[PDB]
């Protein structure tokens, strides 16, 4: 991308989850229409990707859109779907192992992303980039209750089973909440909230989240 | 006044979750042994109860201890279990509808609390007080094998509106994965035994500021 001065970290998370929230508030604050913020969320994702590749983060999961989000106005649904498609396509121009997880048994799921619903190497690969597209926490848990008979097997067979435990979850837009992102993988996740809206992303947001992470005692109830 | 005037709130959560974390760090900071913090966590719980009753909170769920917590040394297990028993027994002397949710199929689950594993009205009731005792997220979700989502072990406990965690960590530690999917989370930096009413007031000011 371009040259940065990235701090040195004593400890790095294996898996970062990103909640790129605040697109509508960002747009309204700039006197744009609510749905116009999503198109300004793509370059921030690429800056996150570039930083994570440079420091050697193993896996990053981006919250794209939920089944609940598809209750919003058509004009917003078209805007955030278009922006999610573009984000996956942009990572597909770089070096990544791409996975899209979400309900593909829905008219809402974009045909453009079906090819990424199995993990796909692009360029030199290495870093795992996941996207949650038409994802729902209820759909994810209930996927298991149907397609797993046993109980101990249920957990291993949730819809998002390819996505491992989230070490660090970073949420833009100043809300401290999961919005149903990966309930199983996020039970022990250390959560960092950035007050600025996602389109106002700065590398310093990610650096401060990583400083937060390396400062945590990760005890897992022990 | 002696006790801070309880502020008047323009919005209130129906259901507050409490994670009373930091007992061991609190004890170690005082030069006590790791296990000596838990007994100093009981009165804070009663202060939360008193304030929630006064402002008219419908439901409060306390995180007591988890299956993961039973990995800890036996001296710590006995100390936190003893403190959880005493907490429920103290609420049992007041006005509450008490429910204990947790894995009762374990010699770790205290016999004293079996009677509260069905919702129990004490005094005038009018507030629902839940305790998670030998609770595990994994046990909760997998319990359904006993519609499946509506038959999780914690199914009686509704959506958490506001989650307040003491001890400075911003994490769920597996508290009620289903009910916490949209919960607004407020972290208090002070360890649970350093509870002050202003901790709770600031959490509720945070909640009424959320959209
Ligand atoms: C790696 C890259 C390139 C991009 C990652 C970011 C991304 C998915 C951008 C796409 C548009 C976007 C902001 C969607 C998020 O919207 C939801 C959250 O608030 C629902 O409204
Ligand atoms: C009372 C209670 C169950 C607290 C949760 O924190 P924890 O210390 O048990 O977990 P963690 O190690 O994830 O902070
Ligand atoms: C499991 C439980 C009863 C949590 C309360 O604090 P703690 O025992 O986790 O103490 P700390 O967070 O300081 O280790
Ligand atoms: Mg939002
Ligand atoms: Mg703790």
Residue numbers in the entry:
A (entry chain B): -2 to 219
B (entry chain A): -2 to 143, 150 to 214
What does the paper say about this structure?
The FG-complex crystals of MM_0014 (designated as “co-FG”) were soaked with DMAPP for 39 min to elucidate the binding mode of DMAPP at the prenyl acceptor-binding site, because the recognition of DMAPP as the prenyl acceptor substrate is required for the head-to-middle condensation. As a result, surprisingly, by replacing the FG ligand, two DMAPP molecules were found bound to four of the eight protein molecules in the asymmetric unit. DMAPP molecules were accommodated in both the prenyl donor- and acceptor-binding sites, and a Mg2+ ion was coordinated between the pyrophosphate group of DMAPP at the donor-binding site and the α-phosphate of DMAPP at the acceptor-binding site. These DMAPP-binding subunits were all in a closed conformation. In the other four protein molecules, FG and pyrophosphate were still bound in the donor-binding site, while a Mg2+ ion was coordinated between the pyrophosphate and α-phosphate of another pyrophosphate that was bound to the acceptor-binding site. The DMAPP-binding protein molecule formed a dimer, either alone (one of four dimers in the asymmetric unit) or with an FG-binding protein molecule in an open conformation (two of four dimers). The remaining dimer consisted of two FG-binding protein molecules, while only one subunit held an inorganic phosphate at the acceptor-binding site in a closed conformation. The distance between the C1 of DMAPP at the donor-binding site and the C2 of DMAPP at the acceptor-binding site, which corresponded to the C-C bond-forming atoms in the head-to-middle condensation catalyzed by some cPT homologs, was 4.3 Å. This distance seems somewhat long, which could be why this structure could be solved without the complete processing of either a prenyltransfer or a hydrolysis reaction. The interaction between the C-terminal sequence of MM_0014, TLGG, and the substrates of prenyl condensation reactions seems weak; only the main chain nitrogen of Gly223 and the hydroxyl group of Thr221 likely coordinate with the acceptor substrate DMAPP in the DMAPP-binding structure.
MM_0014 from the methanogenic archaeon Methanosarcina mazei is known as a versatile cis-prenyltransferase that accepts both isopentenyl pyrophosphate and dimethylallyl pyrophosphate as acceptor substrates. Cis-prenyltransferase (cPT) generally catalyzes the consecutive head-to-tail condensation of isoprene units and produces (Z,E-mixed)-polyprenyl pyrophosphates. MA1831 and MM_0014, which are orthologous cPTs from the methanogenic archaea Methanosarcina acetivorans and Methanosarcina mazei, respectively, unusually accept both IPP and DMAPP as prenyl acceptor substrates. The overall structure of MM_0014 is in a ζ-fold, which is similar to those of so far reported cPTs.
